[PDB]
Amino acid sequence: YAQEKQDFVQHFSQIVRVLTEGHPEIGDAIARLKEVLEYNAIGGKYNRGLTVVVAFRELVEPRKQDADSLQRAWTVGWCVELLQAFFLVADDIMDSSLTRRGQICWYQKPGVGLDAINDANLLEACIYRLLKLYCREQPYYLNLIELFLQSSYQTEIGQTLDLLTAPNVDLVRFTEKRYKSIVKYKTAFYSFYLPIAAAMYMAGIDGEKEHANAKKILLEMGEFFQIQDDYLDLFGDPSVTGKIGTDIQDNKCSWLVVQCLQRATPEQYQILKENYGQKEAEKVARVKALYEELDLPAVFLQYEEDSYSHIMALIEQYAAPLPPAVFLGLARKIYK
Amino acid sequence: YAQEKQDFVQHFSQIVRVLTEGHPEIGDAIARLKEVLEYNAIGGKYNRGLTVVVAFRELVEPRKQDADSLQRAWTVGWCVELLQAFFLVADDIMDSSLTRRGQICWYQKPGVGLDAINDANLLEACIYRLLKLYCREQPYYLNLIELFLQSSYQTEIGQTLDLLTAPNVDLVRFTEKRYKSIVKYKTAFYSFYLPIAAAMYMAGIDGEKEHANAKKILLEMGEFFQIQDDYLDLFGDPSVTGKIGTDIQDNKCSWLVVQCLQRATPEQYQILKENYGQKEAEKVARVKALYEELDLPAVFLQYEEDSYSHIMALIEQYAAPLPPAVFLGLARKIYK
Ligand SMILES: Cc1ccc(-c2cc3c(N[C@@H](Cc4ccccc4)P(=O)(O)O)ncnc3s2)cc1
Numbered sequence: 001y002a003q004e005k006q007d008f009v010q011h012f013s014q015i016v017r018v019l020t021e022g023h024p025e026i027g028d029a030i031a032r033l034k035e036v037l038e039y040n041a042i043g044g045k046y047n048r049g050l051t052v053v054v055a056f057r058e059l060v061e062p063r064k065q066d067a068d069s070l071q072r073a074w075t076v077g078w079c080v081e082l083l084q085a086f087f088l089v090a091d092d093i094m095d096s097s098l099t100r101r102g103q104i105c106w107y108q109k110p111g112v113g114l115d116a117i118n119d120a121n122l123l124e125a126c127i128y129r130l131l132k133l134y135c136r137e138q139p140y141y142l143n144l145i146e147l148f149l150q151s152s153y154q155t156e157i158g159q160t161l162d163l164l165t166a167p168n169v170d171l172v173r174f175t176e177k178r179y180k181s182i183v184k185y186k187t188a189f190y191s192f193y194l195p196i197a198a199a200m201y202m203a204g205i206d207g208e209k210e211h212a213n214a215k216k217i218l219l220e221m222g223e224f225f226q227i228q229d230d231y232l233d234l235f236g237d238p239s240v241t242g243k244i245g246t247d248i249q250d251n252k253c254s255w256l257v258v259q260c261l262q263r264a265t266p267e268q269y270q271i272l273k274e275n276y277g278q279k280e281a282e283k284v285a286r287v288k289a290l291y292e293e294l295d296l297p298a299v300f301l302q303y304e305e306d307s308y309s310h311i312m313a314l315i316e317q318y319a320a321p322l323p324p325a326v327f328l329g330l331a332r333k334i335y336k
Numbered sequence: 337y338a339q340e341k342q343d344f345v346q347h348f349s350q351i352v353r354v355l356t357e358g359h360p361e362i363g364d365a366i367a368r369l370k371e372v373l374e375y376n377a378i379g380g381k382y383n384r385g386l387t388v389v390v391a392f393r394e395l396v397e398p399r400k401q402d403a404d405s406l407q408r409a410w411t412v413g414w415c416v417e418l419l420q421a422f423f424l425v426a427d428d429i430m431d432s433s434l435t436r437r438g439q440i441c442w443y444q445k446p447g448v449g450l451d452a453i454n455d456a457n458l459l460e461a462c463i464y465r466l467l468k469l470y471c472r473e474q475p476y477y478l479n480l481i482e483l484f485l486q487s488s489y490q491t492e493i494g495q496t497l498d499l500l501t502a503p504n505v506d507l508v509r510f511t512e513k514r515y516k517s518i519v520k521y522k523t524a525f526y527s528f529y530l531p532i533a534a535a536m537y538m539a540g541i542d543g544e545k546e547h548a549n550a551k552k553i554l555l556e557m558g559e560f561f562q563i564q565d566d567y568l569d570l571f572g573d574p575s576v577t578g579k580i581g582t583d584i585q586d587n588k589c590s591w592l593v594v595q596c597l598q599r600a601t602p603e604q605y606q607i608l609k610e611n612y613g614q615k616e617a618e619k620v621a622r623v624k625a626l627y628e629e630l631d632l633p634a635v636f637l638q639y640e641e642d643s644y645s646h647i648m649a650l651i652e653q654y655a656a657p658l659p660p661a662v663f664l665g666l667a668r669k670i671y672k
């Protein structure tokens with residue numbers, strides 16, 4: 001569970017070494033690339049990247065897991081983490097965030113600022129450098145390049161959808177349908193489909209139908225993951241989650257807002273209008289109080305139960321011929 | 337020369353159509369992608385993209401130029417233009433520019449701002465969507481994906497080098513060697529190598545040595561192009577160039593600065609220290625006056641002559657077995 005993790009984090013050092021070599025006077029730029037890698041790619045939980053390694057091992061017969069194969073698996077897992085780091089660095093600029101991962105946002109560091117835009121682009125580029133360096137001779141090379149490019153496009157499109165929805169923001173826009181759509185494109189594809197799909201290609205499983213089948217399970221898991229995330233942001237024990245929720249004083253298309261708007265009287269819509277996004281804590285208290293009044297903790301608990309049933313059904317119908325454990329190991333990481 | 341251009345600009349409409357389709361509720365995002373394409377990809381001179389088409393025609397026997405081949409050529413030319421548009425939109429944010437192409441910078445438009453970061457990423461992604469849609473069945477597909485990814489990486493690295501060199505900027509940093517290095521990575525590879533290299537792959541010419549040979553000529557042309565650009569920014573007739581120069585009141589690693597620092601007394605270094613980058617026109621007058629005093633117009637004219645000789649020598653030594661006209665047509669566009 002957790003020793004596989006230390007191995008994953010220990011490979012990081014090698015990733016940075018290979019990325020940060022023969023050309024003299026680009027030295028200074030390569031030094032900066034190293035600082036960008038170390039600040040931004042380190043310090044998460046590594047679940048997405050690790051999924052690549054775990055799934056790879058569950059998919060591949062042990063007798064085709066030589067040292068070089070495992071190394072490619074580690075490297076591709078790190079590519080998922082670099083993709084994520086590209087997105088976060090850029091998203092923190094666009095949202096004007098202060099911190100991430102308990103640490104000052106890269107762009108907020110003295111002397112970085114909007115130069116972080118190029119830093120982020122570099123993180124994106126390192127994906128394709130690594131795929132080339134480690135995977136270019138493999139039959140799935142082109143498949144992995146395309147999967148990463150496509151994952152980027154889907155995430156960017158979801159970002160666009162998110163930015164159109166939350167500019168002067170309006171709750172009319174925040175429907176269930178638009179919420180699911182943002183989650184699918186902006187979170188679920190890269191977080192859940194990408195890592196398993198990558199493992200699948202590395203293992204030789206390249207059929208469109210199998211990929212489509214895995215995708216159906218994995219995008220559904222992604223939807224639940226984000227909804228639970230939204231729920232917890234407010235109702236989570238901050239000393240368990242290690243996270244203090246800020247969605248409310250920020251005008252976010254949270255799942256809670258979507259359910260609240262579905263369930264609200266005209267009178268209640270106004271109380272939400274007046275309190276959602278003020279940074280005063282009396283106002284933040286208000287919104288929460290209204291969520292309780294409509295028993296969104298109960299709507300959620302119900303949703304979670306239904307979602308668990310649905311996912312197990314999807315695994316039953318669509319897993320084969322992959323081992324159900326590939327999907328069940330993920331489901332266990334996100335249902336409690 | 338100029339009718340090939342109208343055809344190139346006319347294909348644009350098709351590019352936008354294919355990029356901006358089956359999925360309902362991502363409609364809003366796709367509408368935004370269209371506005372991003374139309375604002376940012378249109379309104380240049382299209383020289384880089386057009387080079388793809390011209391070189392392709394000079395390379396390919398006429399009897400393998402069916403309607404579909406030409407269409408791929410147009411599309412890949414547009415991919416060069418999309419790459420450029422990605423870079424510009426992002427660079428204008430990082431530099432805090434006001435205008436580009438005589439038009440307000442995309443990020444400066446009301447309601448865009450730092451959302452332009454995601455817009456730029458989308459422009460980048462559209463490259464790979466187009467390559468897939470038009471070129472996926474072709475034997476050079478992977479070669480073009482890799483060439484575009486590599487061109488992006490080289491340009492980003494050059495950008496990093498540029499940003500480290502011009503933060504509180506210092507003229508100590510602005511050496512000839514660092515100047516050439518920024519130009520090579522940030523401008524020459526994507527502007528000059530990329531379009532010809534793309535044509536070459538489309539024409540079936542994929543050897544490393546031929547690519548290396550073309551690269552040698554093309555990176556040298558790129559160096560001259562940028563140096564002439566720097567020269568003209570200040571000494572160009574603004575009603576011929578259609579451009580009013582701003583390098584001086586902006587602290588840029590211009591070629592003029594590099595030559596000036598090489599040729600300056602201690603006393604002259606100070607006059608440059610005091611005037612480079614003030615927006616007052618008395619101060620901008622000063623710098624110019626000092627450039628004339630050191631006869632940089634004569635250094636340039638000499639440089640240009642030597643550079644022409646050198647390029648013709650490179651074409652002689654390294655063109656074959658490509659038709660010299662591929663390179664000479666470019667040389668004619670940039671020497672006067
Ligand atoms: C593909 C993929 C897989 C797993 C995850 C994450 C899991 C997880 C987590 N998991 C705990 C359970 C949990 C608590 C709170 C929210 C979600 C999950 P654990 O598995 O360590 O017991 N705790 C905190 N953050 C995360 S992010 C994300 C993407």
Ligand SMILES: Cc1ccc(-c2cc3c(N[C@@H](Cc4ccccc4)P(=O)(O)O)ncnc3s2)cc1
Nearest residue numbers: 381383384387527528568666668669670671672
């Ligand atoms: C690959 C490639 C090829 C060509 C170019 C450019 C050419 C060019 C230009 N050319 C004129 C000449 C010229 C004037 C001023 C500076 C450079 C070139 P023309 O060829 O239209 O007579 N005028 C203004 N801008 C440009 S950008 C850039 C990249």
